Design a protein around this ligand. Sequence first.
Ligand SMILES: Nc1nc2c(ncn2[C@@H]2O[C@H](COP(=O)(O)O)[C@@H](O)[C@H]2O)c(=O)[nH]1
Ligand SMILES: Nc1nc2c(ncn2[C@@H]2O[C@H](COP(=O)(O)O)[C@@H](O)[C@H]2O)c(=O)[nH]1
Ligand SMILES: [Mg+2]
Lengths: 201, 204
Amino acid sequence: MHHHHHHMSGITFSKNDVEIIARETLYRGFFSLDLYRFRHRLFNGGMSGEITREIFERGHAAVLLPFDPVRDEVVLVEQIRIAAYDTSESPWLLEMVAGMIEAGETVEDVARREALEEAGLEVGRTKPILSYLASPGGTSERLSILVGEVDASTADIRVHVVSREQAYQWVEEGKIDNAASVIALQWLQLHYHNLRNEWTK
Amino acid sequence: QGITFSKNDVEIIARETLYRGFFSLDLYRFRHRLFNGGMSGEITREIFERGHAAVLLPFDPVRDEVVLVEQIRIAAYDTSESPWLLEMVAGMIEAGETVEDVARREALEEAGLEVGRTKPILSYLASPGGTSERLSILVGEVDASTAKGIHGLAEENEDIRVHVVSREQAYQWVEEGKIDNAASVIALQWLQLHYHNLRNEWTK
Ligand SMILES: Nc1nc2c(ncn2[C@@H]2O[C@H](COP(=O)(O)O)[C@@H](O)[C@H]2O)c(=O)[nH]1
Ligand SMILES: Nc1nc2c(ncn2[C@@H]2O[C@H](COP(=O)(O)O)[C@@H](O)[C@H]2O)c(=O)[nH]1
Ligand SMILES: [Mg+2]
């Protein structure tokens, strides 16, 4: 069909449209700094020349929003995140439960495990929220968020229990400003009414 | 309620460059107060340093439309169906610049868009266990009928396609996983929570 014209044939291109020529690990410690060399299709029709990009590689994470549907409360975990220091009033952040996903593990298994270990919470039902790329211009990291049913009365890390409304107001005010928690709590603000009905049936 | 400790309670002893390239990886060495009442020992953490960004959600309040930009993000490759992503206009904030200056410049360079009024959405840490990066999101008033075509600086090997969707369509794409990068998810969830008042404010 080479005589067929271009017009006779969401996003435009797939993995068939990129060639990763080479990968190198330039730094290996707890995390890695990798270098990708690749060429890719251009929107105008041609192929790019070879492009090189640095990629921060630290694996991928499972995240759990602990929500008590009886009490309309969320459980937050506080701990120091030194990387926040230079742009934040304090490096101690209020966050969701989270942990790295190891080979062959599922998001749900990690989320449930971490909820018990960080916050001492037994999780009942879970539902997916969303899975997102934290900052794909520079890091490969993907984080997959679930909401988990908890009894908030049963709640170096410190555990905080607050109303959903307070937690969301802290997002609005900038007092909760890490991506995983912002995404989870915005989702909860959009979905809590149906979720509470589903989980208190 | 709220957090327990402040910058009075942590000392950064030193920082060491582990990798110096286009971006950097630094080792922070620090000590900090513990919730149990003591002081930690010396802690180290590897931190990815890549500066900070301004992000623009281009929203047409008359048409209830959103402008997205499509381009390859190779880091997405290993965990995504395709490394081409649908994203918000964005760019790095250089020394002395304002978030608005960058957002307006990138809106023109990445999408061919002039911007009218602007309002903050939220400023967030992308992944603060391992990177310092902060991204500050604005919503910008645009005429989505002027958003079309292929943009980006060809010299910088930047190849960007503009897409226009309705707001409801963009949000549906978030729900379905077709838009799954933090900046766009945060911006579009915010828009779902605020569009009624924002359209009223900008169509008066
Ligand atoms: N050499 C080099 N340039 C980069 C890298 N990441 C981004 N850039 C440059 O940053 C600009 C676009 O960055 P973006 O906003 O798409 O993340 C282009 O000038 C591009 O060449 C990298 O890892 N290495
Ligand atoms: N112990 C330690 N872990 C580090 C360092 N830099 C990065 N990490 C990573 O951070 C992980 C702990 O993350 P956290 O549990 O604090 O969210 C470690 O398991 C390790 O992979 C470092 O200097 N020391
Ligand atoms: Mg740009």
